Amino acid sequence: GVNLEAFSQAISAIQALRSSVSRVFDCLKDGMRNKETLEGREKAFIANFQDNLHSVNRDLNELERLSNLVGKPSENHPLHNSGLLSLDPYSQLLQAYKWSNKLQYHAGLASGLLNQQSLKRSANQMTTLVLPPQYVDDVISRIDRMFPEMSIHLSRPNGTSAMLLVTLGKVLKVIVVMRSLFIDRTIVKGYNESVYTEDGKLDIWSKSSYQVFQKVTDHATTALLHYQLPQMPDVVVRSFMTWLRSYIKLFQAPCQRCGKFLQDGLPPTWRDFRTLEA
Amino acid sequence: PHFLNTPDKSPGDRLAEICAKITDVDIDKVMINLKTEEFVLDMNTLQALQQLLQWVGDFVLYLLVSLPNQGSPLRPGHSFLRDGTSLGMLRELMVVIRIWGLLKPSCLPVYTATSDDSMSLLFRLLTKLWICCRDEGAASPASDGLVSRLQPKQPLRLRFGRAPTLPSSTSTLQLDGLTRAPGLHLGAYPTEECKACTRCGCVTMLKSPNKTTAVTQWEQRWIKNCLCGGLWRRVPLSCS
Incomplete structure (x- = not known):
């Protein structure tokens, strides 16, 4: 697994294991300059001694470590070394192996700091923001279905615009009827109250529920109207899907008791809590 | 003359002075060749070798490393x-401190390695350079x-007492009243101050009460003006 990175911290740990004892003897390198207030200075010595206990903690750190070992030792890395002398002038690639990573890592910061944009204007510098091809919808559908344990379906019986339905662990399916590219004008229900497979005769609208999911529907509409980025509609629908995923539990109830109202949910901050409080 | 020994043909220090007429190496031989018994004074002598006499030991060590420094940008170097x-006087001091250590194990060794008697080889090299x-x-x-050859025993960081001067050519x-503008070895010298530490300007850098029990010899011997000791000054320790 990825627990190997934990060993990195362990490295720093044993580093202190050295420094600690140095900080001990350095503290013994000189005596009382001028206490004049108390004799805790000597205790200060023992204070450094206390940090030596940290070393024992290092031994404890190995209890959580050693999850399991992976097969095929050496992880296909030194296979290039098995080549003849002709292959040895190849380490460069391995360097790039880190470099590329750094690249990503650099972007990992850069893109992050790209969040604070400076686009004083976005028009009068040019188009067709509505996606022409009726194939990018299927692309977005497949990208969403790439997510596990969350099934998505779509029929689009109305026309050019997009129509889709999504289901989760509960029967709280969500019907989203939006334009070509970005999600807008959706609704949610629960327990066959919509039944948008063959409701009456087709995927009906019915604009209703028993006064429980209505707040969730309004919040999802707000999230759709708020996450409408100027570009990258795929990012928009992915953010929408991630937001929708946050209701798969409906179990916790922080910053209040589980008796304030019918339910509780408003996670635009990537964390749900008691509703009617933000 | 600090020996309460038994009398003999001549004085103890006087008879020790003639040690010049002796072989080059193996001080352990010449010491019994002159006299061994009448050199002990009392049990309460275990305060000088490990505390202050160590200096002279280190002293001769500081000679060795400083021997091959004629090419340095200083004709006598240090x-x-x-x-x-x-x-020769120092060599006599070495042989008497050798018989002292023979009389008591709390002497000043090399403190580093090769004890199984570095002092012997040190002394023989010193006598070699002497006779040379x-x-x-x-x-x-x-x-x-x-x-x-640099044996793995030489320590460093010795005082080498000195003081500033008045280079007003x-x-x-122009100076203010304070805040000057630039331009006894019985231990008693830690990193930070630990007592009143009445010092002096010539070389002393010593403590005021000497913090001892029966080493009053040096203390009383230097209560008054030391070597050009008109500069017996005092200054308190710093505070944060």
């Missing part, structure tokens, strides 16, 4: 000490190359 007479420089000798013999020296 020091030269090629007098011989004073060197006693009566108008050479300086840098082939022996110089071999004694120049010709024109002007």
